[PDB]
Design a protein around this ligand. Structure first.
Ligand SMILES: Cc1ccc(C(=O)c2cc(O)c(O)c([N+](=O)[O-])c2)cc1
Ligand SMILES: Cc1ccc(C(=O)c2cc(O)c(O)c([N+](=O)[O-])c2)cc1
Lengths: 114, 114, 114, 114
């Protein structure tokens, strides 16, 4: 599995379960094409987004829809979502984990690449 | 000054000087309109982005063009940029500082609201 | 002012006001000597910790007592405090801002050096 | 496995492999007793630190010796180490993952509790 997303909740100290994640790929157009999407599991992880055949060199944007999540825990947040834009597979295919740590007024994101 | 952006470099432990910052506002269209832009100063700060007259309730996206910055320090980074999407002035006008801490494979962003 | 500490609250999106901060310096003993302390102001900042005469090369530990702060906002946190250990003035005297961003189950710390 | 530590490198976008981790527990003395220690594996993870029998309610400090790690990648860092102090098992036994994301001038730490 070449691209996985993991999301953590800094407020409850737990995985963020059932969070919506959308992945876009920048086309030759200079437009964002919808690439893949899904919701995180009980472990805060989302696997099965894509296959190594489909996941080519390019510029990707990962959007994590965090505002719904925060409402659903009784919280009126501030961000519309968390977004991460990165270039992928530039050096040949890699395994990428894009991880996000969420708080109402802040977030951190990191890529772990193997 | 109702909206200011501050950018820090986690690699050199210093302000990120002369970084490009673009602000967009979501229009009734559901399109991003260009709202304001500029480059950070020697202190890593960008003031004068807007006036309190122009800075109304709405959804804003702040894009920090970090890839140029990292190249200019001799570094091939991973993100195309850092992006922060948030709703503003929902509760009446506030002063917003959107701060970003940059590393090649990671970033953190926070809003400080007064 | 050669050493300043700034503390932000990721939960309320605001400065952390009236937070206790203790600074220790490692002695020849290999013991921590109490070096300086104080509480953050309404801006989340603590200035006047030391003078450039007193702030010599050495290993320092900055401890931010965050648990009291979180209780005082109605919150039972997880960390006893945030701690940052660093070597100072190794390359000649600098101005150091040690900044901390707090959440109940997480924190980030950075040094900005001039 | 009730306590595990994971360490990530924000500079290389990878796990931090073979990093030293020491765990201390605050005794009735108000002294830190050495509780457990080990080095992270190729995945940046350290398991087998303790057993659920030994891991009781108390105040723990996790110290990650990051300075050696940064030297070993050709880097003169700033922190002596990363330290996390927290209260454990206060509400009955939990599984705790203490995760740390490292950069030369910054770090973030979070607890994920199950
Ligand atoms: C995500 C993040 C975390 C920490 C910092 C940060 O270190 C910082 C430092 C400052 O001197 C300062 O004035 C502010 N601010 O006003 O927000 C932030 C900046 C961004
Ligand atoms: C402070 C911080 C922020 C983000 C990460 C982080 O990126 C991360 C990545 C993982 O694959 C993973 O399994 C976990 N975890 O279990 O906690 C954390 C780690 C630490």
């Amino acid at each position: 599995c070449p691209l996985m997303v993991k999301v953590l909740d800094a407020v409850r100290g737990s995985p963020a379960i059932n969070v919506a994640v959308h992945v876009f790929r920048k086309a030759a157009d200079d437009t964002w094409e919808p690439f893949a999407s899904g919701k995180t599991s009980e472990s805060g992880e989302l696997h099965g987004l894509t296959t190594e055949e489909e996941f080519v060199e390019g510029i990707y944007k990962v959007e994590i829809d965090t505002k719904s999540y925060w409402k659903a825990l009784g919280i009126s947040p501030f961000h519309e979502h968390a977004e991460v834009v990165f270039t992928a597979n530039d050096s040949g295919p890699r395994r990428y984990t894009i991880a996000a740590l969420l708080s109402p007024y802040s977030y951190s994101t990191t890529a772990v690449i193997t």
